[PDB]
Amino acid sequence: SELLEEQKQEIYEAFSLFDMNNDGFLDYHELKVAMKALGFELPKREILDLIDEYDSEGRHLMKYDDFYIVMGEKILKRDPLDEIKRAFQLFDDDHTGKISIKNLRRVAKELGETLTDEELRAMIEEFDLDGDGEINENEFIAICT
Amino acid sequence: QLKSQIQQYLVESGNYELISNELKARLLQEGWVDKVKDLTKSEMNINESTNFTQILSTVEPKALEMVSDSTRETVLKQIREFLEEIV
Amino acid sequence: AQLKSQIQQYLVESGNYELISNELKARLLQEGWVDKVKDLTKSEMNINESTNFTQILSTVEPKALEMVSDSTRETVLKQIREFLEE
Amino acid sequence: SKQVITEQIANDLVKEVVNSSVISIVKREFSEANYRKDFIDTMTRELYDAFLHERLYLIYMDSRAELKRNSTLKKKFFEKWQA
């Protein structure tokens, strides 16, 4: 168990989000979307095999403890770069290849964040060297690295 | 009533999978799955929350419509065929 | 005239037409003749379920009228004979 | 003697009882069939409704999962950037 505290939050938030009846278990459908909430998408057979493997009860469900092992593992073996790029696409939904202010504001609002229009201009300024008042990919990648 | 004796056999015969997958594959191929996923997400950008009934009511009516006539009639028949072999 | 009808008339007025009929329906039921028709009707329907009620009925009537055993026709004759001799 | 009239009347009676029976028997099988069809049409429409209901639910599940992954990513890297 060598997960950052926020990684442990990712896992717990994702399991809770599909523990529809707080029974503490997830069925196949819920398990399959829970995993997707962590970026992992698996073949129906794959997922089912995990369930039977950890199905101590015989109820065809997976308890949180087991979800945390299976998930924790795959999260450790996740590539830092692919995450930074998937993020850069999320930021730039205008599909330009450059993060613009309306983008940043759109993300700010989105995440409940509260930032003056100028906080965001300063955010941009900090790393988009050079040209033009917006961050492109290898600019963004630098930031996160 | 005895309808439950059917619902059960529908699943315990593997027929629930057959028809659900045929429905999926067809809704998917004709791009139903996509639009629906978009507009649900879209509403969800009103997120926090809102629970499934509040989304279903706002999208179900205009989703049940866009199912291809071709898809609708194929799935209805497959289901029909199922029950005929039982009654 | 032929005036068989007079004899029908008494047969009916004395309650015997009905009693004999009921007894006929009784034996037809006992001897499975009704099941043999509830079946014949299902074959014709299974053959073509596009052919309507009327057509099915026609096909069945003459056949059912023949399924009647001859010991059953007999009892009906015996009972109608006996009333006549009165 | 002249009791071929007996035969005629015995025949008419049997004729009438039979017709009576086959008619109501046929009427049964038809109404019975028509009843099955009514049942089936109703369940076909009901199960179909369920199949679409479920598909909708699994697209609801899938939309929350995608929005969750993305919001975790936007937050993680927006906050780090903001550092």
Author numbering:
A (entry chain A): 15 to 159
B (entry chain C): 7 to 93
C (entry chain D): 6 to 91
D (entry chain B): 722 to 804
Publication passage describing the model:
The yeast Sac3:Cdc31:Sus1:Thp1 (TREX-2) complex facilitates the repositioning and association of actively transcribing genes with nuclear pores (NPCs)—“gene gating”—that is central to integrating transcription, processing, and mRNA nuclear export. Sac3 is the central component of TREX-2 and contains a conserved Sac3/germinal center-associated nuclear protein (GANP) domain, which, along with the short N domain, binds both Mex67:Mtr2 and Thp1, a factor involved in transcription elongation. A region within the Sac3 C region (Sac3CID) binds Sus1 and the calmodulin-like protein, Cdc31 (Fischer et al., 2004). Sus1 is also a component of SAGA, a large complex involved in chromatin remodeling and transcription activation.
Crystals were obtained of Sac3 residues 723–805 and 753–805 complexed with both Cdc31 and Sus1. The somewhat higher values for the R factor and Rfree for this structure were a consequence of the pseudotranslation (see Chook et al., 1998). Figures 2A and 2B and Movie S1 illustrate the structure of this complex in which Sac3 was present as a long, gently undulating α helix to which were bound one Cdc31 and two Sus1 chains. The CID region comprises Sac3 residues 723–805 and forms a gently undulating, continuous 12.5 nm α helix, which is encircled by two Sus1 chains and one Cdc31 chain. The two Sus1 binding sites on Sac3CID were designated Sus1A (residues 726–751) and Sus1B (residues 760–788). Although there were extensive interfaces between Sac3 and its three partners, there was negligible interaction between Sus1A and Sus1B or between Sus1B and Cdc31. The Sus1A chain appeared to have a slightly less intimate interaction with Sac3 than the Sus1B chain.
